[PDB]
Ligand binder design. Structure first.
Ligand code: BCL
Ligand code: BCL
Ligand code: BCL
Ligand SMILES: C/C=C1/c2cc3[nH]c4c(c3C)C(=O)[C@H](C(=O)OC)c4c3nc(cc4[nH]c(cc(n2)[C@@H]1C)c(C(C)=O)c4C)[C@@H](C)[C@@H]3CCC(=O)OC/C=C(\C)CCC[C@H](C)CCC[C@H](C)CCCC(C)C
Ligand SMILES: C/C=C1/c2cc3[nH]c4c(c3C)C(=O)[C@H](C(=O)OC)c4c3nc(cc4[nH]c(cc(n2)[C@@H]1C)c(C(C)=O)c4C)[C@@H](C)[C@@H]3CCC(=O)OC/C=C(\C)CCC[C@H](C)CCC[C@H](C)CCCC(C)C
Ligand SMILES: CC(C)=CCC/C(C)=C/CC/C(C)=C/CC/C(C)=C/CC/C(C)=C/CC/C(C)=C/CC/C(C)=C/CC/C(C)=C/COP(=O)(O)OP(=O)(O)O
Ligand SMILES: CC(C)=CCC/C(C)=C/CC/C(C)=C/CC/C(C)=C/CC/C(C)=C/CC/C(C)=C/CC/C(C)=C/CC1=C(C)C(=O)c2ccccc2C1=O
Ligand code: HEC
Ligand code: HEC
Ligand code: HEC
Ligand SMILES: CC(C)=CCC/C(C)=C/C=C\C(C)=C\C=C\C(C)=C\C=C/C=C(C)/C=C/C=C(\C)CC/C=C(\C)CCCC(C)C
Ligand SMILES: CCCCCCCC/C=C\CCCCCCCCOC(=O)[C@H](O)CO
Ligand SMILES: [Fe+2]
Lengths: 273, 243, 323, 332
């Protein structure tokens, strides 16, 4: 049930709220007050998806879709089968996300480590709010949000991008895309480096941290460092949504044309026009 | 006629879809998930055959480790439930339980690539120094969590393999000893080193080194774990609820 | 709070280390210098750098490709320095616009494009030798080289392999900021919406997956930097409490965990699968699939929606409609 | 750089597909005011009398009207075409039956073209229709015309800069860009798609698998056709002041039915109408117009979407003069 080095860490404490009341384990999982509330919102959310899906025309996983209301309903309540189910599932999703994050804070405190992981988990929760709450609020209706469906929510992303002619020219998009590329590149570089030092091949000796910095000083002339690549990788990954949140919330509230035309601030400067 | 069409209503891109799922789950479940089990297994209270590393400075190791000795835990179970938390039976900082726990690392000195001791104080690493513009902590007071001066910084321990300071050494006030503290537990100001992990009196029981001018891998674990245990155990309130 | 995870409070200086390789120690060039502000979030030493034959061949082949691109771009503005600096994002080198099949297109309609791509292919191959040989010279595994080769392979797929499989140099990627962007939409339109290519979704999941992994892994090592978690090579061969607490964080959160070594195998595998998935999708595109959306419609996977505005017949299908 | 909130948004597809218009009220307001300059209908006149085919000397199209009904149209045409030059823009002041001025012979062909649009192209103009004003907007040269090469600015009433001039070769890319909604697509979708009926706008297959005989080598259309279609669609979107979801469900651009809006079908008739107007009415006019009206290849000014729409999904937001001037169509 326990790892070979787990028992000495299985002490009480580190909780935010609840005290000893929920400070226990269920198998390998830790519970806490936020593990209870997480199961609460997940059960409530999965239930709502099931009841709404039974009312639909298909049980095919790729075809099921739970969509937001019509634009005319605005930010008010919507009929259960005409957007209400979407509204309740969204509330449950946020509850499960925020509970999952605070649960991670409690596990961090019991282990005596920093809160770096739950703080980083706030980034994808923040972007989810930009799409489903913040941008809908600025535009005036919940129907501007994406639907909950495996293949249907891709059509949302597709139409939304074309609503502004060529979404590729979105400057917040170009930044979000650049971080997505460089982060996946840096993870292959870094994961490959550590494995190259510990697995030199044949029956050779495991190399050193000196070998790490020497390889990348040879290839590119600079090595950022063992600890610094972990601060960098978290910075590159987080800025996929941090910079992308700008371009998404500007499409509509702050810009209604096609994104190629936005670049007229440069192209249309009078002295070289 | 169509390119890629096969028998029945089948086509080539359809076949590769099944092949792609098979390869992905084969790599995930039959390889990556078994490499995840090279530490902490087997469980107590599917496994890969052992992996053996040839160490850079002589000798080998095979993971996971089987230590010739094991420690006795000063912990008391809170209840008979299989997933009940444990409870310290004494001083958790010196007993090293919970966040104060350290691992049974090798009692060997971590070495540079050319065989020298990696973590050494600047009194030994005379070719090293602090960069121009940063605070030289030597001679500055160490202020603990209760606001009391715990001692005075005497040296910095540098990693000669990465050119990175990792500890401060301070004379413990009224104890005729020096203790090491990881720089992560130090808030370096211009006139003081702030340490909120433990109180001033708790600096007396920081694990001591066997040699004055070097440190082993297990001693580094013991020193780091003691301050981390203070995040939960320095005062009775840190083990309770925040709200 | 661990302030070291934010920046280096006290930077250390020392004699610069040189680890000898099997060959090429004499080909390292440059006097190292130290940036104070770079040292706060990384190592302060910049340089030296290794040259070598493959690294030199990469610069020669690569500068040739770039020079061919920039010259053709300067001609598009008739060698006006102001307009070139202005219109730079819009200028480009294009593949053949007419259909010559696999015949080497004229210089004014795709010839310069095919030649810059040849030199770019030689530049990438040269740089892979350097990435591969530097690991062998230092006694390291080729884990980075083989990840690099998958990215080079995907570039070959959209650059010449798929053009050869369908038999037209017109399907290749143009050189340029906006022009290579515009290719993405024409390539998705032509082949029936890339959102319905399963390997597109596979490559997207792995690309998102590298974002999740480096955020979780990077933050985890920062969280255990108080115990020297960044000293990972020696945490592999001699487990410390840093990666013990790290494994137990994830074991107590998601019910399982990896090792400090294997989490890198996950990260190296996810990054690799971004290119492997994208390549297989380009190789199937056009060769055996003409319309990915209808391909999903053929297999019943496409989602359908009720009519909001009334359905619209194809007017070209109407009786008596013009051609 | 950015446009303030709030924005006008409509819904053109099923909820959750993010289909619909995204408008800026300040832009729509300025266009609504500009299009409100449409002179109201002239008052009704006496319906009894001889036909001008009897009364007058050189009437060839409007011969069935009475004199009062015929001079009314002669006033509206002047209001719509040449209100500042007056009657003598097209007429010899001393003989109104003479064709001695080039605008006379062009205006008669335009009278025929106007009746043709309202009679033969109702699949598009419907009961709204077009008059002289729909394009001319009060000037003899319509503000939004095309030549056989890109030109800037789009509104010919604006003074061009040096680089905007078609003679300056260093600004060609910008002349191409602004006609395709500032994109870098390297194709002129007017001469390619709207000047005549030679090319096929549709480029996406209607088969799941590649059909044998059209899928390899020189059997294939070049992928340049996909860019060019994309270029026409950015020009169409800009000239109407709209986006794709006004017409397509971006799920499947090539599919109709529930994947297309009713406006996409009207747009399809609009493409066939532009080609008819350019090929059979506007292009042959280069033999009647003076050399100062022609393009660098001897071409007369020709029409695209923006000639009538001028940035609005409907010309003049749907304003109509059809019932007020039956002599302009539909023709029984
Ligand atoms: C025609 C369509 C457009 C287009 C339309 C859009 C639109 C529209 C948007 C993007 C956005 C993004 N685009 Mg795109 N995009 C296009 C082309 C591209 C290309 C390319 C090579 O061409 C790339 C690389 C990208 C890439 C990207 C991303 C980097 C970026 C952010 C994604 C995001 O917000 O995820 C969001 C992900 C989340 C919110 C996940 C949150 C997860 C939560 C916290 C946890 C979930 C737990 C789960 C329920 C648990 C289940 C239990 C199981 C046990 C696991 N796009 C084309 C041109 N793109 C966005 C952006 O930022 O734009 C500026 C955006 O809004
Ligand atoms: C603005 C940008 C868009 C966007 C654009 C795209 C595009 C484009 C693609 C995806 C793809 C996917 N997206 Mg999406 N996606 C967005 C936001 C979300 C949200 C959310 C909480 O908002 C979720 C749950 C998802 C989930 C998913 C998966 C179904 C899939 C693979 C992702 C992946 O590997 O991630 C990294 C995470 C992991 C590798 C870990 C495992 C995660 C598992 C797979 C999550 C399963 C979720 C499943 C739907 C069940 C949900 C809960 C049920 C109630 C049980 N996306 C936003 C709205 N997404 C791709 C695909 O194939 O879709 C079918 C694809 O092509
Ligand atoms: C309208 C536009 C289309 C679209 C069109 C395409 C097309 C077309 C392709 C992709 C592909 C990809 N798309 Mg896209 N895509 C869209 C929407 C999305 C969305 C989204 C949320 O909507 C997402 C997340 C993505 C994401 C992705 C990527 C994961 C994927 C792989 C490419 C990549 O990573 O390249 C980043 C990495 C590289 C380019 C590798 C580079 C490696 C080399 C070695 C670097 C050399 C550097 C050197 C200095 C260069 C010197 C040059 C000198 C001249 C010498 N797309 C929409 C639907 N997408 C590909 C794919 O998977 O197809 C199946 C693909 O071919
Ligand atoms: C920029 C930084 C990023 C990043 C980072 C990090 N990511 C983290 C952490 C960090 C740091 C963690 O520590 C945490 C974790 O422990 O990981 C193992 C986590 C996790 N990242 C998940 C998914 C994930 N991350 C994505 C995005 C990024 N992550 C980007 C890249 C995407 C994308 C792109 O789609 C996905 C799918 C889960 C696996 C996990 C949360 C589980 C949860 O919260 O459980 C609690 C909730 C549930 C078990 C389900 C609740 C169901 C609701 C009620 C009903 C369904 C609603 C739903 C909207 C329906 C959708 C339909 C669908 C078709 C639209
Ligand atoms: C999924 C995994 C991915 C991944 C992975 C990996 N990526 C790697 C490695 C791995 C594993 C390496 O080992 C290697 C390396 O070394 O890492 C440090 C590398 C690299 N990834 C580069 C860029 C990059 N990767 C991208 C994509 C992904 N990568 C995806 C995401 C993208 C995108 C998205 O566009 C970009 C731009 C280069 C920096 C570098 C190759 C240099 C080269 O081959 O140069 C060859 C070209 C030259 C030497 C030209 C030099 C020109 C000078 C200025 C001459 C003067 C010009 C003069 C003015 C002209 C007149
Ligand atoms: C023992 C234990 C705890 C194991 C845990 C292991 C574990 C959870 C590992 C997680 C890591 C894994 C496995 C990640 C893999 C998931 C990844 C990276 C990506 C998934 C991406 C994904 C779902 C892509 C789908 C592609 C798309 C959009 C396809 C749409 C069209 C479609 C479905 C066509 C199908 C038509 C065909 C051929 C047949 C249908 O009939
Ligand atoms: C039964 C019941 C109701 C119990 C109540 C208690 C309770 C709260 C139970 C939770 C139940 C729930 C919701 C379980 C679902 C948990 C989830 C979301 C599982 C998703 C798993 C997935 C797909 C993760 C994606 C990321 C991924 C592919 C990880 C594989 C590799 C791993 C394990 C990375 C994690 C990992 C990282 C990132 C390190 O850095 C590290 C460093 C040193 C040692 C180990 C590690 C390590 O394991
Ligand atoms: C822009 C074009 C235009 C304008 C403005 C214009 N004319 Fe006309 N006019 C024509 C054309 C063309 C015809 C021949 C139409 C036909 O054959 O039915 C014509 C025919 C006539 C005739 C018939 C004479 C004959 O015997 O053939 C009269 C009278 C006339 N116009 C009067 C007027 C008046 C009155 C005005 C202004 C108040 C005016 N014109 C301004 C173009 C114009
Ligand atoms: C007002 C009308 C309208 C607008 C706006 C519009 N479309 Fe089109 N589009 C059409 C019509 C009609 C066709 C069919 C052309 C034909 O039948 O000859 C078409 C054709 C297409 C095609 C090719 C269809 C095929 O079978 O090959 C694509 C792709 C496309 N449009 C995408 C777009 C894009 C991209 C945009 C904007 C950026 C856009 N549409 C905006 C009306 C429109
Ligand atoms: C010479 C006249 C003319 C030209 C050229 C023209 N339009 Fe139209 N169009 C009209 C008129 C008039 C209407 C008003 C029809 C109505 O009220 O329903 C209209 C209506 C439309 C509509 C319907 C909008 C709605 O809200 O119902 C679309 C879509 C459209 N045009 C697209 C196009 C396209 C596509 C082209 C060219 C390729 C084009 N227009 C060029 C005259 C024109
Ligand atoms: C000043 C400094 C430091 C750097 C300058 C960089 C610079 C300004 C470059 C100039 C303009 C820019 C930014 C251009 C950007 C171009 C981009 C983004 C291109 C992106 C993709 C292009 C691709 C993938 C092209 C691939 C082409 C190929 C793989 C061709 C393969 C060719 C062959 C196999 C030839 C064999 C056939 C034989 C019979 C001829
Ligand atoms: C992965 C891309 C990282 C880019 C970092 C490039 C930094 C430039 C470093 C150049 C070092 C060249 C030697 C320095 C001494 C000059 C003689
Ligand atoms: Fe790492």
């Amino acid at each position: 049930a326990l790892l070979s080095f787990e028992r000495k860490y299985r002490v009480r404490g580190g909780t935010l709220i609840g005290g000893d009341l929920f400070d226990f384990w269920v198998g390998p999982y830790f519970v806490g007050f936020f593990g209870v509330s997480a199961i609460f919102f997940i059960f409530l959310g999965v239930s709502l998806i099931g009841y709404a899906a039974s009312q639909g025309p298909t049980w095919d996983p790729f075809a099921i879709s739970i969509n937001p209301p019509d634009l005319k309903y605005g930010l008010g309540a919507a009929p259960l089968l005409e957007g209400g189910f979407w509204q309740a599932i969204t509330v449950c999703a946020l509850g499960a996300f925020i509970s999952w994050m605070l649960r991670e804070v409690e596990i961090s405190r019991k282990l005596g480590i920093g809160w770096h992981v739950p703080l980083a988990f706030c980034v994808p929760i923040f972007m989810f709010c930009v799409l489903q709450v913040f941008r809908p609020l600025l535009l005036g209706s919940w129907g501007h949000a994406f639907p909950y469906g495996i293949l249907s929510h891709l059509d949302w992303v597709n139409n939304f991008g074309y609503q502004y002619l060529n979404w590729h020219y979105n400057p917040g998009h170009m930044s979000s895309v650049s971080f997505l590329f460089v982060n996946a590149m840096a993870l292959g570089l870094h994961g490959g480096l550590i494995l190259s030092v510990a697995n030199p091949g044949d029956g050779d000796k495991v190399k050193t941290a000196e070998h790490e910095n020497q390889y990348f000083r040879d290839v590119v002339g600079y090595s950022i460092g063992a600890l610094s690549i972990h601060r960098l990788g978290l910075f590159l990954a987080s800025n996929i949504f941090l910079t992308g949140a700008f371009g998404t919330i500007a499409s509509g509230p702050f810009w209604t044309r096609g994104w190629p035309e936005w670049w007229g601030w440069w192209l249309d400067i009078p002295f070289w026009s | 006629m169509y390119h890629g069409a096969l028998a029945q209503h089948l086509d080539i891109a359809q076949l590769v879809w099944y092949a792609q799922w098979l390869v992905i789950w084969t790599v995930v479940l039959l390889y990556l998930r078994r490499e995840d089990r090279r530490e902490g297994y087997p469980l107590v209270e599917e496994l890969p055959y052992p992996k053996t590393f040839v160490l850079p400075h002589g000798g080998t190791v095979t993971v996971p480790r089987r230590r010739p000795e094991t420690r006795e835990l000063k912990l008391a179970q809170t209840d008979g439930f299989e997933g009940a938390p444990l409870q310290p039976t004494g001083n958790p900082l010196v007993d090293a339980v919970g966040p104060a726990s350290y691992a049974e690392r090798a009692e060997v000195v971590d070495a540079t690539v050319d065989g020298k001791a990696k973590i050494v104080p600047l009194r030994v690493a005379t070719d090293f120094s602090i960069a121009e513009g940063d605070v030289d902590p030597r001679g500055l007071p160490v202020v603990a969590a209760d606001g009391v001066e715990a001692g005075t910084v005497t040296d910095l321990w540098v990693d000669r393999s990465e050119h990175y300071f990792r500890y401060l050494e301070l004379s413990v006030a009224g104890s005729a000893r020096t203790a090491l503290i990881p720089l992560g537990f130090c808030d370096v100001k211009k006139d003081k080193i702030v340490v909120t992990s433990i109180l001033s009196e708790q600096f007396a029981n920081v694990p001591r080194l066997q040699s004055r001018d070097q440190i082993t891998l297990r001693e580094e674990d013991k020193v780091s774990a003691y301050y981390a245990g203070g995040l939960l155990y320095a005062t009775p309130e840190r083990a309770e609820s925040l709200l | 709070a661990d302030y070291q995870t934010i920046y280096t409070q006290i930077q250390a200086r020392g004699p610069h280390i040189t680890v000898s390789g099997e060959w090429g120690d004499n080909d390292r060039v440059g006097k190292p210098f130290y940036s104070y502000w770079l040292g706060k979030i990384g190592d302060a030493q910049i340089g030296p750098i290794y040259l070598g034959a493959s690294g030199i061949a990469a610069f020669a082949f690569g500068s040739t490709a770039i020079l061919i691109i920039l010259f053709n771009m300067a001609a598009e503005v008739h060698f006006d320095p102001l307009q070139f600096f202005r219109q730079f994002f819009w200028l480009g080198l294009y593949p053949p616009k007419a259909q010559y099949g696999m015949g080497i297109p004229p210089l004014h309609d795709g010839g310069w494009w095919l030649m810059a791509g040849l030199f770019m292919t030689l530049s990438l191959g040269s740089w892979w030798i350097r990435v591969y040989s530097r690991a062998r010279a230092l006694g390291l595994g080729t884990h980075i080289a083989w990840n690099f080769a998958a990215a080079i392979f995907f570039v070959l797929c959209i650059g010449c392999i798929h053009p050869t499989l369908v038999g037209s140099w017109s399907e290749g990627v143009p050189f340029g900021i906006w022009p290579h962007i515009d290719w993405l939409t024409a390539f998705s339109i032509r082949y029936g919406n890339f959102y319905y290519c399963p390997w597109h979704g596979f490559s997207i999941g792995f690309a998102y997956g590298c974002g999740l992994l480096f955020a979780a892994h990077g933050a985890t090592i920062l969280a255990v930097a108080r115990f020297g978690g960044d000293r990972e090579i020696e945490q592999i061969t001699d487990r410390g409490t840093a990666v013990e607490r790290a494994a137990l964080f994830w074991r107590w959160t998601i019910g399982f965990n990896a090792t400090i070594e294997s989490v890198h195998r996950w990260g190296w595998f996810f990054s690799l699968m971004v290119m492997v998935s994208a390549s297989v999708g380009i190789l199937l595109t056009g060769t055996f699939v003409d319309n990915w959306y209808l391909w999903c419609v053929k297999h019943g996977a496409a989602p359908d929606y009720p009519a909001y505005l009334p359905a619209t017949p194809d007017p070209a299908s109407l009786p008596g409609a013009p051609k | 750089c950015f446009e303030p909130p709030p924005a006008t948004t409509t819904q053109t597809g099923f909820r959750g597909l993010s289909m619909g218009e995204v408008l800026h009220p300040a832009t729509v307001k300025a266009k609504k005011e500009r299009d409100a300059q449409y002179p109201p209908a002239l008052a009704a006149v006496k319906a009894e009398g001889p036909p001008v085919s009897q009364v007058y000397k050189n009437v060839k199209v409007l011969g069935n009207l009475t004199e009062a009904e015929f001079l009314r149209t002669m006033t509206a045409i002047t209001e719509w075409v040449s209100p500042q030059e007056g009657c003598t823009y097209c007429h010899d002041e001393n003989n109104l039956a003479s064709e001695a001025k080039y605008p006379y012979v062009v205006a008669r062909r335009m009278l025929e073209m106007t009746r043709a649009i309202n009679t033969n192209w109702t699949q598009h103009v419907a009961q709204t229709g077009v008059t002289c004003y729909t394009c001319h907007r009060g000037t003899p040269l319509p503000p939004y015309v095309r030549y056989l090469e890109p030109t800037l600015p789009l509104n010919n009433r604006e003074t061009p800069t040096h680089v905007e001039r078609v003679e300056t070769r260093s600004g060609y890319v910008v002349r191409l860009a602004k006609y395709t909604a500032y994109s870098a697509l390297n194709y002129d979708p007017f001469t390619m798609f709207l000047a005549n009926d030679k090319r096929q706008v549709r480029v996406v297959p209607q088969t799941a698998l590649p059909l044998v005989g059209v899928s390899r080598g020189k059997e294939r259309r070049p992928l340049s056709d996909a860019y060019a279609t994309f270029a026409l669609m950015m020009s169409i979107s800009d000239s109407l002041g709209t986006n794709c979801t006004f017409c397509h469900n971006a799920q499947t651009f090539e599919s109709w039915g529930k994947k297309s809006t009713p406006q996409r079908a009207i747009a399809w008739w609009g493409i066939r109408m532009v080609r008819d107007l350019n090929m059979n009415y506007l292009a042959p006019l280069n033999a009647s117009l003076p050399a100062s009206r022609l393009g660098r290849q001897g071409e007369a000014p020709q029409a695209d979407c923006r000639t009538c729409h001028q940035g609005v999904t409907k010309p003049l937001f749907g304003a109509s003069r059809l019932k007020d001037y039956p002599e302009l169509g539909p023709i029984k």
